[PDB]
C-alpha cells in the first residue's frame, strides 16, 4: 500500500560521515593555526592538555558515530521511512475524526443567523 | 412558540450528534485485534470499563431517538 | 419503498487504505523489528530488559572507557547542527569530481604536516592529573 | 525484490566494514591518548605521534571518499535528528526504536478502538433506529450493508 513519504528533518548517512569528516578535520586545521606560536599565555602545557581535550573530544564525537551505525545495523531491510510515513499516516488518520466533529461543530455554528423567529 | 421549539430541538438534536461524536472519539479503549499482540495503554488516555462504555452508547442512542 | 434523501444505494464506501484495524506493522513487514525489540517473547515468558545506555555497544573495544560520553559530563558538545549542514562529463567522470570535491581539506595549505610536526615536537614530559 | 535484497547485503557489508574503521580510528586514539599521558618526550615518540596522525587522517580520507563513492548505499540509507540527538544525551538508540515502534502499535490500537466504538454506535443506533421507526428497516439495512462493505483488507490479520 501506498504512503505519504516525507522528506522533511532527515539526513543521510553520507552526509553524516562526511559532514563528521569535515568538522573534526577542520577544527584539527583551527588547533595547528591557533598553536603554531608559543607564548607565555599559552605555553606548550596548555598546548598540551588543549590538544589532549581535543583528542578526547574526537573520541566522544566518533564514538557516538559509531554507535549511530551500530544502530543502522539494526534495521535489516532498510524500511526506516516506511516507519515514519505510517506514523505520520496514523497521525492524519487519528486527526481525521476529530476534524469531522470540528466539521460537524462549523455546521452547527453556520446555523446561528439561519433561523425565522416568533413574530411581534 | 411551537415553531420555536422546534427550532430549539432541531438545534440541540444536531448538537446531540456532535456530542455524541465527542463522546465516542474521546472515550474509547483499546482492544486486541489478536490475543498475541501486546496490550497497553498511556495516562493521558481516558480508559473506561467496556460494559459500562456501551451503557453510555445505548443511552446516547436512546437520548437522540428520542428527541426525534 | 419511499426513498429518503442521500440514502444512495448505489454509492459505495470501501475500507481505509491500510486499513488500521490490521495490525500495520505485520502488513508492511515490521515484525522483524517488533519481535527483535519486543518487552516480551512471543510464546509467554519475559524477554532480558535492555539497558538504558549503550554499555553493549561500546563493551567491544579496549579502551579507557568506564564512564558514559553524555552531555552533562562537559566532555562532549553540541555537533548536531554542524552534523546537519549541507551544501563533455558522463556519470563516471561526475562522480570522480563528485569524490573529489572534498578532498581540498585535507593537503597543506590547510593541513600542513611539517607545521604539525613543528608544533608537536613542543611537547614537553608529563600531564597533570588530580 | 532482487535488488533491494542484494543491496541490504551490501547494506549489511558496509556497514560492518564502517564498525571496523571507527573502530580502528578508536584505537588509534586510545594509543595517542596513552602517548599523550605517558610522553617520555623522546623523538622517536614524537615520530610515531606523527604516524599515529597519518594513520588517522587516511583513515578519515577512506571513509569520507566511500561517502563520496557512488558504489554505496551510505546515501541511500536515512538518518533522523531524534536518533543523533538521543545518542548525543548518552541513552541508548534501541530505546528509540522500541519507543517508536511502540508508537506505531499505540496509534494502531487507538485508531481501532475508535473504529470499534464507532462500529458499536452504528449498530446500536441502527438497532434503535429500526426498533422507533418500522418504516426505516429497509434504509437502515441498505445503510449498514454499505457500510460494511465486502471484506479485502480485514479478513487477514
Not at chain 1, 521511512?81 to 466533529?101: Q, Y
Not at chain 2, 474509547?28 to 467496556?50: C, I, W, Y
Not at chain 4, 617520555?40 to 578519515?60: C, F, S, W, Y
Not at chain 4, 535528528?81 to 538521543?86: F, R
Request: net charge negative; with cysteine.
Amino acid at each position: 500500500p501506498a504512503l505519504p513519504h516525507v522528506e522533511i528533518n532527515q539526513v543521510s548517512l553520507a552526509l553524516v560521515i562526511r559532514n563528521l569528516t569535515v568538522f573534526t578535520m577542520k577544527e584539527l586545521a583551527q588547533y595547528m593555526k591557533t598553536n603554531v606560536h608559543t607564548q607565555a599565555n599559552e605555553p606548550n602545557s596548555a598546548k598540551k592538555i588543549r590538544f589532549l581535550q581535543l583528542i578526547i573530544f574526537l573520541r566522544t564525537q566518533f564514538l557516538k558515530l559509531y554507535v549511530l551505525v551500530k544502530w543502522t545495523r539494526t534495521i535489516k531491510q532498510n524500511n526506516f521511512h516506511v516507519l515514519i510515513d505510517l506514523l505520520n499516516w496514523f497521525r492524519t488518520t487519528n486527526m481525521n475524526v476529530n476534524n469531522c466533529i470540528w466539521a460537524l461543530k462549523s455546521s452547527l455554528n453556520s446555523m446561528t443567523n439561519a433561523k425565522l423567529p416568533n413574530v411581534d | 412558540d411551537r415553531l420555536t421549539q422546534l427550532q430549539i430541538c432541531l438545534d440541540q438534536m444536531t448538537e446531540q450528534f456532535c456530542a455524541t461524536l465527542n463522546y465516542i472519539d474521546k472515550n474509547h479503549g483499546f482492544e486486541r485485534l489478536t490475543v498475541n499482540e501486546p496490550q497497553m495503554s498511556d495516562k493521558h488516555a481516558t480508559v473506561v470499563p467496556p460494559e459500562e462504555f456501551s451503557n453510555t452508547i445505548d443511552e446516547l442512542s436512546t437520548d437522540i431517538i428520542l428527541k426525534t | 419503498p419511499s426513498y429518503y434523501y442521500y440514502v444512495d444505494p448505489e454509492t459505495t464506501y470501501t475500507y481505509q487504505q491500510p486499513n488500521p484495524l490490521q495490525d500495520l506493522i505485520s502488513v508492511y513487514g515490521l515484525d522483524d523489528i517488533s519481535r527483535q525489540v519486543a518487552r516480551t517473547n512471543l510464546d509467554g515468558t519475559k524477554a532480558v530488559k535492555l539497558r538504558k545506555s549503550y554499555k553493549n555497544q561500546i563493551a567491544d573495544l579496549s579502551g579507557k572507557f568506564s564512564t558514559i560520553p553524555t552531555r552533562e559530563n562537559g566532555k562532549g558538545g553540541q555537533i548536531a547542527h554542524i552534523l546537519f549542514q549541507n551544501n563533455n562529463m558522463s556519470e563516471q567522470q561526475w562522480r570522480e569530481q563528485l569524490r573529489n570535491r572534498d578532498i581540498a581539506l585535507f593537503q597543506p595549505p590547510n593541513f600542513d604536516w611539517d607545521l604539525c610536526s613543528s608544533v608537536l615536537s613542543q611537547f614537553e614530559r608529563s600531564y597533570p592529573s588530580e | 525484490m532482487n535488488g533491494n535484497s542484494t543491496n541490504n547485503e551490501q547494506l549489511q557489508q558496509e556497514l560492518a566494514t564502517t564498525q571496523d574503521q571507527v573502530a580502528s580510528i578508536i584505537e588509534s586514539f586510545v594509543e595517542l591518548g596513552v602517548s599523550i599521558y605517558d610522553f617520555p618526550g623522546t623523538p622517536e615518540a614524537t615520530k610515531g605521534m606523527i604516524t599515529n596522525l597519518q594513520r588517522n587522517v587516511d583513515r578519515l580520507y577512506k571513509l569520507n571518499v566511500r561517502s563520496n563513492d557512488p558504489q554505496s548505499s551510505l546515501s541511500k540509507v536515512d538518518i533522523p535528528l531524534e536518533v543523533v540527538q538521543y545518542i548525543e544525551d548518552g541513552r541508548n538508540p534501541d530505546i528509540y526504536t522500541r519507543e517508536f515502534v511502540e508508537a506505531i502499535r499505540r496509534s494502531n490500537q487507538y485508531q481501532r478502538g475508535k473504529m470499534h466504538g464507532l462500529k458499536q454506535l452504528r449498530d446500536s443506533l441502527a438497532d434503535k433506529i429500526v426498533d422507533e421507526f418500522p418504516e426505516l428497516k429497509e434504509p437502515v439495512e441498505d445503510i449498514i450493508k454499505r457500510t460494511s462493505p465486502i471484506d479485502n483488507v480485514s479478513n487477514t490479520h
